[model samples]
Target: QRACPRILKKCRRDSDCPGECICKGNGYCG
Candidate 1:
């Protein structure tokens, strides 16, 4: 989303989404 890694950090939980996101429970800056 939002152009790859640039937006991945916005995700809340990595599991909540897919491998595309890497937030993982409040962990910012994926």
Candidate 2:
């Protein structure tokens, strides 16, 4: 899903973090 990565990179906070990128401290999406 190419959109998945794009969406994750645009996220500005935990609330916006995608399901796959959630938890484990992957740094702020924004």
Candidate 3:
């Protein structure tokens, strides 16, 4: 079980994002 917002989130690195989302060059995790 997990509870993380699954959406485009502002991030500086992959670790900043939750779940399978990854931080893109645009500074967003999706």
Candidate 4:
């Protein structure tokens, strides 16, 4: 969790990516 806060990419349903990404349906973020 404390690895990369700004990776700007993950499967957190918009946790890692910005508002433009829909990670909620995918495995990774945008």
List candidate 4 stretches off by more than 4 Å: 1-8, 24-26
Against the hidden reference, what TM-scores do the models get?
0.21, 0.26, 0.56, 0.27
Query: Which lDDT tens digits does candidate 3 get at residues 1-30?
Result: 334555767998878888866777788876
Model 4's C-alpha root-mean-square deviation from the true structure amounts to 8.3
Give a tens-digit lDDT track for model 4, residues 1-30: 223333435575555565455564556654
Tell me the tens digit of each residue's lDDT in model 1 across 1-30.
422353445555655544555564556535
Q: lDDT scores for all predictions?
A: 0.50, 0.45, 0.74, 0.51
| Deviation in Å, model 4, residue 20 alpha carbon | 1.4
In model 4, the worst 10-residue window by lDDT is: 1-10
**Candidates sorted on lDDT, descending:** 3, 4, 1, 2
The candidate, 2 or 3, that scores higher on TM-score is 3
On TM-score, the leading prediction is 3
Runs of candidate 1 exceeding 4 Å displacement: 1-3, 8-11, 17-19, 24-26
Q: Could you tally the backbone clashes for each prediction?
A: 1, 0, 0, 0
**Per-residue lDDT for 14 in model 1?**
59
lDDT (Cα, 0-100) at 8 in candidate 4: 38
